[PDB]
Amino acid sequence: GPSVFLFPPKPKDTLMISRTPEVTCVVVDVSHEDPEVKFNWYVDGVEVHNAKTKPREEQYNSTYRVVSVLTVLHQDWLNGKEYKCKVSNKALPAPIEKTISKAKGQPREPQVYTLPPSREEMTKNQVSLSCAVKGFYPSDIAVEWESNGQPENNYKTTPPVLDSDGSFFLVSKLTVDKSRWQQGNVFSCSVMHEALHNHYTQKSLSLS
Amino acid sequence: GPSVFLFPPKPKDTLMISRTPEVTCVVVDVSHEDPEVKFNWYVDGVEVHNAKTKPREEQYNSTYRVVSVLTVLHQDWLNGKEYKCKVSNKALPAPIEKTISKAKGQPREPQVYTLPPSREEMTKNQVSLSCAVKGFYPSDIAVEWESNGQPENNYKTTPPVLDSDGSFFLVSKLTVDKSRWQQGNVFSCSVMHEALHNHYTQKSLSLS
């Protein structure tokens, strides 16, 4: 039957005032027979009416998918307000309710460490640069890579893992051509987190 | 003082027998004064001696960083064996111990849904394709994007989020040039997870 996703804001959006964080409610597998979906949004148990529901999309299998987006104020997110998406449809026994809210607890500052290619790895058409981060709380964090003003997008960042002290750790690995590593190009790992000064730090790395 | 990372295997490595999963113990901020670091590895409380410790690396600030890697057998990982890295150094009050193990619980199968660009988003030099996954357990999962045999690396995958039924959900967003979306190129979201048939499923998407 009908299935619901409720996605939190992007970390980067909550951290920069110039950006617009938003919560996204996605309904899938709604039947052709009764295609009408009603969204009700709530912030801390109280209904709100400023969400923007998108037009339904018929799937190749006859089902519909529908997205509803609610903007979140920066102060509201930080104040730990609970955002709720309730989804109603005739083909449901009861409405489906999803909730998301900012994690509770004292923020803790990420420690960022970069690691260059190993010697044994330093012998191929491609090398990996690591950006290891630990000690952060909450687990909401944005990690990006760049070189010479141009974003580097060929990187994978592990999900934050809960550490033994209640903080989180991760690593982001950038894969570049061994040649570019040799030209002496500087590569920068930028990290954004609420507990950082200015919500921002950058660590850079190059050969030698 | 000395700080330790203990990283789990890559999901993809644990899922394919032809691959070699490994656990990585990374020690940072070890002092110039006493640079000697000893690793002891344990699998379920019993010491093992087949780890491969890399040569120490002097940092620009005089500290050292050292990595030790332990291969993990596929059967051992699935059997829930606890991997422990103990790290000893003269500048430590007590040795530091980190542990990782496969999450306990019944595996649950990911449901994968792709979402094309919105109409309002369908008006820029760049569009985003979404691959939404939910209902999976454990949270270890590999999600990749590809088009015409060539990997698509300009995508970001949200960390798995714990759902209300104890399973996890995420979304992976691929950003491509609006033009390529128009040429009618097919884009494929591949997902690997233990609960999938053959540890693999693929969902494809294109214009029209």
Curated annotation (Swiss-Prot), chains A, B:
Disulfide bonds join 25-85, 131-189. Residues 105-208 are annotated as: CH3. One of its GO terms (molecular function) is Fc-gamma receptor I complex binding. GO terms for cellular component: blood microparticle; extracellular exosome; extracellular region; extracellular space; IgG immunoglobulin complex; immunoglobulin complex, circulating; plasma membrane. Keywords: Adaptive immunity, Cell membrane, Chromosomal rearrangement, Disulfide bond, Glycoprotein, Immunity, Immunoglobulin, Immunoglobulin domain, Membrane, Secreted, Transmembrane, Transmembrane helix. Glycans are attached at residue 61. GO terms for biological process: adaptive immune response; antibacterial humoral response; antibody-dependent cellular cytotoxicity; B cell receptor signaling pathway; complement activation, classical pathway; complement-dependent cytotoxicity. Residues 2-101, 110-206 form the Ig-like domain. It is linked to Multiple myeloma: A malignant tumor of plasma cells usually arising in the bone marrow and characterized by diffuse involvement of the skeletal system, hyperglobulinemia, Bence-Jones proteinuria and anemia. Complications of multiple myeloma are bone pain, hypercalcemia, renal failure and spinal cord compression. The aberrant antibodies that are produced lead to impaired humoral immunity and patients have a high prevalence of infection. Amyloidosis may develop in some patients. Constant region of immunoglobulin heavy chains. Immunoglobulins, also known as antibodies, are membrane-bound or secreted glycoproteins produced by B lymphocytes. In the recognition phase of humoral immunity, the membrane-bound immunoglobulins serve as receptors which, upon binding of a specific antigen, trigger the clonal expansion and differentiation of B lymphocytes into immunoglobulins-secreting plasma cells. Secreted immunoglobulins mediate the effector phase of humoral immunity, which results in the elimination of bound antigens. This is Immunoglobulin heavy constant gamma 1. The chain holds residues 120 to 327 of 399 of the full protein.
